[PDB]
Amino acid sequence: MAYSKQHDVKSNPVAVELGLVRHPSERLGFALPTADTVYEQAIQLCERLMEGEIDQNGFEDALRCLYGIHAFRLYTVEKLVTSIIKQLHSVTTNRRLA
Amino acid sequence: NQFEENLHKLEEERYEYDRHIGANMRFIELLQIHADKMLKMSEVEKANWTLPSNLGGKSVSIYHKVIKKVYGKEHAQQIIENLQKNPSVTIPIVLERLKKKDREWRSLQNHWNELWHDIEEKNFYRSLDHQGVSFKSVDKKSTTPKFLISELRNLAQQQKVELSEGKVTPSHQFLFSYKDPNIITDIARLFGVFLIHGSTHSAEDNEKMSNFLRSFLSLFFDVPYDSFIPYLPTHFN
Amino acid sequence: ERAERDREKAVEKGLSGATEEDIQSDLQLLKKELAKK
Amino acid sequence: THERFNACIDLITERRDDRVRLATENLMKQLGNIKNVMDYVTKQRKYQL
Amino acid sequence: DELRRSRDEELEIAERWRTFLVNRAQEEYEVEMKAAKEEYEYRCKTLKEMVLS
Amino acid sequence: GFGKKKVSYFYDEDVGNYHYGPQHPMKPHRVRMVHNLVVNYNLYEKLNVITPVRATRNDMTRCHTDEYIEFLWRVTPDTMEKFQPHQLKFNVGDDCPVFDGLYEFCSISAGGSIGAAQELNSGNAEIAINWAGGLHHAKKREASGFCYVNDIALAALELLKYHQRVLYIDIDVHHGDGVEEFFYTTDRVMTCSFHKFGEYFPGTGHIKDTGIGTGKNYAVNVPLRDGIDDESYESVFKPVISHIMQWFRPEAVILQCGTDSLAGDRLGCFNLSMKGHSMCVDFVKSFNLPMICVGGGGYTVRNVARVWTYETGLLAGEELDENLPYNDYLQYYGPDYKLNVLSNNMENHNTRQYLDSITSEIIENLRNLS
Ligand SMILES: [K+]
Ligand SMILES: [K+]
Ligand SMILES: [Zn+2]
């Protein structure tokens, strides 16, 4: 459905004539990654965020332009991955665990 | 949610302009009947003309509201008295004044429409998002190791209690499922990007963690080693 | 903020009803045309 | 000057022309609205009788 | 007959209201077209003066 | 020759112009908006638009008291310095303010509702709409919660001249307490209301409030919790109503179509959408009974306008295009400019077992019937 919205919606012509229509993701502060599926774009965006090209707000807004409101769970991924790293740290230091 | 509230304020201002203009236009619509009667009668009748207490319409409250708004409530009694008493003198004056005020208000409304448009677009999309901000906290207190181990221990204790109740309690408390075999390669990709672009650990720690993750993931989930290579680098210098 | 607490008042004074010199003129015109009776 | 100055002139006339296009686009839609309202009122009065 | 007379008067009033509405729209649009032309003329003149200065 | 039957539709062009108070959540203006779309979808060619005959004093005191209606008909926003006893007695002044044209407003509402009842009594229609009506919170002795004259009671009384049983369905997010109190001890009108029961207005509606006297088992309450969605609502709505239609067997329905039960409302706290809300109306209509559909709540005017327009086009038997045609209030409907209201990601609190429990209880109660 993310792709069925990305590529299968048509504006209201009356508000196109009067100059009222503005779509987001055509205004974002940056550009969106292009791919064959949305999921790939989502992954590239998480990757950009983890790097530092994207802030938290821009990452969330891009997720909204992509998926709508069913992508809020992913607003924390960075933090989550951080915590996962911490686990490995302990598991990489227990001497008997090897 | 502050974004729903911004939307509600905007809708309130919109409504304000619209209600003033609409009431004024209804009154004008009334006067436009008496004017066109006036201009179609002899010159002596115009002097002996009077309007009843309801100005010839159905709903006097709108009309008195309009007049009090336009002329202030200090000069409105004079205008209503002269509109009832001698119409043929008082209707043209008031009608023209109302037309001028309508013109001005329409101009102002057309001026404000654009500012409101941009405010609405700035506030709108993150308003169907009640749970987007009430989650950066619950996820925290569900990612604490303390919470994890506490939950585990409570599960074990209540399951032992049910085991001593004579009930049927299974062996495992958690049942996870991993169907797609590729998502793990994607999580590996994320791991590698973090490790390289994390400002917390040292190069050798990332290296050890990378090799260990390679081995452990490839082995536990039974996914080919070769897929994990591009995302988990062996040398971090 | 100083901006939005200003556009609030700018909106508020929009409607504003008729002005003072204008109602004075309409009153003077009324009385004049009443003299012509 | 047949130069960058002419470019500024053309990017000003762009603004003017989009304004004019918006106004003449408003007008026709408003006249359609009015036509609808009045056809409504006419049929309504006849039916009420 | 009371009904017929009321209806005929209301139809006349409708026709005389449509005219006012249309003239209102036309005036509203003349204002904006004149404003656009005036503003653009002033902009071009001010730019010519600014370039000369 | 007389062909199909069309939907009668009551509208009075002055109704949009009454204004409660400075920042009051209730705006009659919204009905104007609905009409401006019904005109611009060219819907009016499938309806019969009728002007209501304003109701008088001797028509409003068939339910209310002479003192209350007299106070209504006499008060004005200026001379209310002399009515300070009456303000206390009649519950007027803070949530139900006294404004300009109060009595005229009430007469327009009640006149639309009584006119619809007379339309069904006469045989001229089988559906009748009146969006200015449906003020279901007004008591016989007082004003309560944005309402002053309870016109659903008057419609019901006028319906009971030739129909032996009447059913009143209420889907405003609140409890329709006036219309329950009126017909609480009788078995000729069955009321059924779905509402948020908790620390909520008005505070009544408990599941064990099912009538006294002869009206024992002839009131139905369905107390839900926050964030209910379209499928949960459908699961709890369709069984109850199916069994009411089976066992009570009415002859005329009054459907209140409040729309503060929609996602994003100013006061309500549910999570329905345009299709979830319209599901109820279509299901009720599918039974082929004389029906009245009145307004109700609704305090986000853009959502209310779009939903009531959709439901009007849906009662008329049409199918509206999802792009809004140019109308006088186009800038209220940004930024999609579509005929649709969308749900959100707020969290549901009505677990499956809760809904199963209350459905079972209510169906036993209704099995007590004939
Ligand atoms: K209810
Ligand atoms: K009952
Ligand atoms: Zn309500």
Swiss-Prot record, chain B:
Indicate where this protein resides in the cell: Nucleus
Full-length numbering of the shown residues: 646 to 882 of 1522
Name the source's superkingdom: Eukaryota
* UniProt function note: Has a role in modulating the nuclear import of TF1 virus-like particles. Essential for viability.
**Name assigned to this protein:** Paired amphipathic helix protein pst1
From Swiss-Prot, chain C:
Location comes to: Nucleus
Q: List the disulfide bonds.
A: none
- Summarize the subunit comment: Component of the clr6 histone deacetylase complex I composed of at least clr6, png2, prw1, pst1 and sds3.
Which family does the entry's similarity section mention?
Answer: Belongs to the SDS3 family.
Q: What is this protein's function? A: Component of the clr6 histone deacetylase complex I responsible for the deacetylation of lysine residues on the N-terminal part of the core histones (H2A, H2B, H3 and H4). Histone deacetylation gives a tag for epigenetic repression and plays an important role in transcriptional regulation, cell cycle progression and developmental events.
Please report the name of this protein according to its UniProt entry. Transcriptional regulatory protein sds3
- The species is Schizosaccharomyces pombe (strain 972 / ATCC 24843) (Fission yeast)
List the gene name.
sds3
From Swiss-Prot, chain D:
Q: Where in the cell is it found?
A: Nucleus
Q: Signal peptide position in this chain?
A: none
Top-level division of the source organism's lineage: Eukaryota
Subunit organization: Component of the RPD3C(L) complex.
- Show which stretch of the intact protein is covered: 345 to 393 of 491
This protein's name: Transcriptional regulatory protein dep1
Q: What functional role does this protein have?
A: Component of the RPD3C(L) histone deacetylase complex (HDAC) responsible for the deacetylation of lysine residues on the N-terminal part of the core histones (H2A, H2B, H3 and H4). Histone deacetylation gives a tag for epigenetic repression and plays an important role in transcriptional regulation, cell cycle progression and developmental events.
Gene name? Answer: dep1
Swiss-Prot record, chain F:
Q: What family does the entry list?
A: Belongs to the histone deacetylase family. HD type 1 subfamily.
Entry's Gene Ontology cellular component terms = chromatin; cytosol; nucleus; Rpd3L complex; Rpd3L-Expanded complex; Rpd3S complex
What's this protein's function?
Responsible for the deacetylation of lysine residues on the N-terminal part of the core histones (H2A, H2B, H3 and H4). Histone deacetylation gives a tag for epigenetic repression and plays an important role in transcriptional regulation, cell cycle progression and developmental events. Histone deacetylases act via the formation of large multiprotein complexes. Has a role in chromatin assembly and chromosome segregation.
**Molecular function as annotated in GO:** histone deacetylase activity; histone H3K14 deacetylase activity, hydrolytic mechanism; histone H3K9 deacetylase activity, hydrolytic mechanism; histone H4K12 deacetylase activity, hydrolytic mechanism; histone H4K16 deacetylase activity, hydrolytic mechanism; histone H4K5 deacetylase activity, hydrolytic mechanism; histone H4K8 deacetylase activity, hydrolytic mechanism; protein lysine deacetylase activity
Report the source organism.
Schizosaccharomyces pombe (strain 972 / ATCC 24843) (Fission yeast)
Q: Which reaction does it catalyse?
A: N(6)-acetyl-L-lysyl-[histone] + H2O = L-lysyl-[histone] + acetate
What is annotated as the active site? 137
- Look up the EC number in the record and give it: 3.5.1.98
* The protein's name: Histone deacetylase clr6
Specify where the region named Histone deacetylase lies, as residue ranges. 5-317
Subunit comment: Heterotetramer of alp13, clr6, prw1 and pst2.
